[PDB]
Amino acid sequence: SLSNKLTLDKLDVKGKRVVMRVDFNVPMKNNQITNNQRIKAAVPSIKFCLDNGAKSVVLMSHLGRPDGVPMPDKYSLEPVAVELKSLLGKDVLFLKDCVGPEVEKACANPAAGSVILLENLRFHVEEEGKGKDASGNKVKAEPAKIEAFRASLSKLGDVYVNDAFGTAHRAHSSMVGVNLPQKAGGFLMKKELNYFAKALESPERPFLAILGGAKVADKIQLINNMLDKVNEMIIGGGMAFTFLKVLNNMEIGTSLFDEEGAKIVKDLMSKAEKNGVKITLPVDFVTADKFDENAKTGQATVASGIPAGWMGLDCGPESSKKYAEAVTRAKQIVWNGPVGVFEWEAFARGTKALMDEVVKATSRGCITIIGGGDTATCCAKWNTEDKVSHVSTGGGASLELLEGKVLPGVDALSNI
Ligand SMILES: Nc1ncnc2c1ncn2[C@@H]1O[C@H](COP(=O)(O)OP(=O)(O)OP(=O)(O)O)[C@@H](O)[C@H]1O
Ligand code: NA
Numbered sequence: 001s002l003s004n005k006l007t008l009d010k011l012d013v014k015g016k017r018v019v020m021r022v023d024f025n026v027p028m029k030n031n032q033i034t035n036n037q038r039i040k041a042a043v044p045s046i047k048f049c050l051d052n053g054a055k056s057v058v059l060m061s062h063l064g065r066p067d068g069v070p071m072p073d074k075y076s077l078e079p080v081a082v083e084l085k086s087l088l089g090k091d092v093l094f095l096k097d098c099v100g101p102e103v104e105k106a107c108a109n110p111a112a113g114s115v116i117l118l119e120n121l122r123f124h125v126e127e128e129g130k131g132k133d134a135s136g137n138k139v140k141a142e143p144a145k146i147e148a149f150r151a152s153l154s155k156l157g158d159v160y161v162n163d164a165f166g167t168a169h170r171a172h173s174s175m176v177g178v179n180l181p182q183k184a185g186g187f188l189m190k191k192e193l194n195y196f197a198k199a200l201e202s203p204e205r206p207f208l209a210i211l212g213g214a215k216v217a218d219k220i221q222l223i224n225n226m227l228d229k230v231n232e233m234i235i236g237g238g239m240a241f242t243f244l245k246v247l248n249n250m251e252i253g254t255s256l257f258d259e260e261g262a263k264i265v266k267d268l269m270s271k272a273e274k275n276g277v278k279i280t281l282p283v284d285f286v287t288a289d290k291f292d293e294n295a296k297t298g299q300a301t302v303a304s305g306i307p308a309g310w311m312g313l314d315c316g317p318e319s320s321k322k323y324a325e326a327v328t329r330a331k332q333i334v335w336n337g338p339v340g341v342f343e344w345e346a347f348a349r350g351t352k353a354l355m356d357e358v359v360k361a362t363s364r365g366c367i368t369i370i371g372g373g374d375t376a377t378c379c380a381k382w383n384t385e386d387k388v389s390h391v392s393t394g395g396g397a398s399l400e401l402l403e404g405k406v407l408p409g410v411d412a413l414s415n416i
Contacts, residue, residue: 068131212237213337
């Protein structure tokens with residue numbers, strides 16, 4: 001997987017400036033970092049570079065989805081710089097941009113051992129290649145400016161390391177576009193890829209995938225290929241309402257809905273039937289009159305529908321029972337995406353109950369893999385990081401491995 005690729009343990013960094021993509025896309029609440037998992041996970045690679053004599057380590061990441069507009073009031077990485085201090089035992093220089101002559105000067109010839117964190121890559125449309133303007137109109141990036149963006153990032157180091165497993169499914173500029181002669185996979189990239197390579201070679205069966213969360217447009221497009229690998233799927237969280245509206249003609253109110261994915265729902269169900277994959281969808285819900293921690297709440301079922309102006313933000317008790325039945329049958333589980341808005345206590349019961357079931361499954365020998373920026377925060381919140389088989393820093397990235405793909409961030413590394 002990385003067998004063919006240059007990795008950091010084989011990269012001479014002595015006297016070299018290292019430019020490192022990392023996944024510091026950490027969850028935030030009340031403007032605080034709620035889980036430093038993804039930051040801590042990159043420390044081994046950073047520390048290795050500094051201990052083996054790197055002149056500098058320049059760290060670069062996105063945070064959230066600002067869609068190519070500078071929104072430091074809301075998606076700045078400065079809080080991550082602070083947290084990384086503590087985890088490293090080294091101070092960190094935070095720059096307010098990631099490209100341009102001022103950044104290039106700050107990284108051109110740093111004091112020996114400097115750790116530099118750049119501002120959010122996605123404040124530039126050239127990272128993703130597309131985004132929105134500040135008025136919210138979709139925009140494409142211009143090829144020549146994408147090249148200039150990649151050229152600028154490439155000047156910030158002499159060698160490149162990608163340790164950003166959580167983002168490895170994204171063919172973004174900082175992930176596939178850095179032009180330096182040595183492009184090496186970091187130790188987190190190696191740890192995660194090696195874990196999944198073995199867990200996915202010959203899964204214990206039944207193999208259950210649990211797909212929830214809120215990235216519906218993206219992740220509904222992964223189900224088709226996953227249906228060739230798994231024996232059961234829970235489709236919950238925000239993902240479920242697109243399925244229920246199409247299959248059950250359910251009223252879903254203002255719940256998350258994907259117009260494009262709705263067009264393939266019946267094809268996915270046909271393929272699940274063809275491949276013998278049991279699909280478990282929720283049958284009841286905790287509702288809210290608005291997207292707010294303190295919203296008024298209600299209950300609902302698929303038969304009742306969700307009232308107009310209301311949204312389903314958690315599953316209900318009968319859904320938790322059905323989810324639990326699927327977990328009990330499983331011998332291997334991969335779970336990405338909470339089955340409700342677990343950050344808010346009114347909407348956390350379904351995710352907590354499913355966590356309880358997954359922990360119990362682990363205790364009787366199920367191989368249990370939970371991954372994602374927010375889903376791993378469930379493990380931190382309820383203190384189950386040591387009670388499942390593997391907590392991954394990749395969510396969507398892990399689902400694309402489950403599909404059987406080579407991740408773009410891996411593919412772009414140097415061959416041995
Ligand atoms: N019914 C729902 N409506 C809206 N949001 C939901 C619902 N159920 C869960 N969520 C939200 O889904 C979010 C997580 O979805 P997401 O797909 O980002 O998962 P993730 O584990 O961070 O995955 P990745 O690592 O790929 O980003 C949480 O913030 C949670 O509030
Ligand atoms: Na997320």
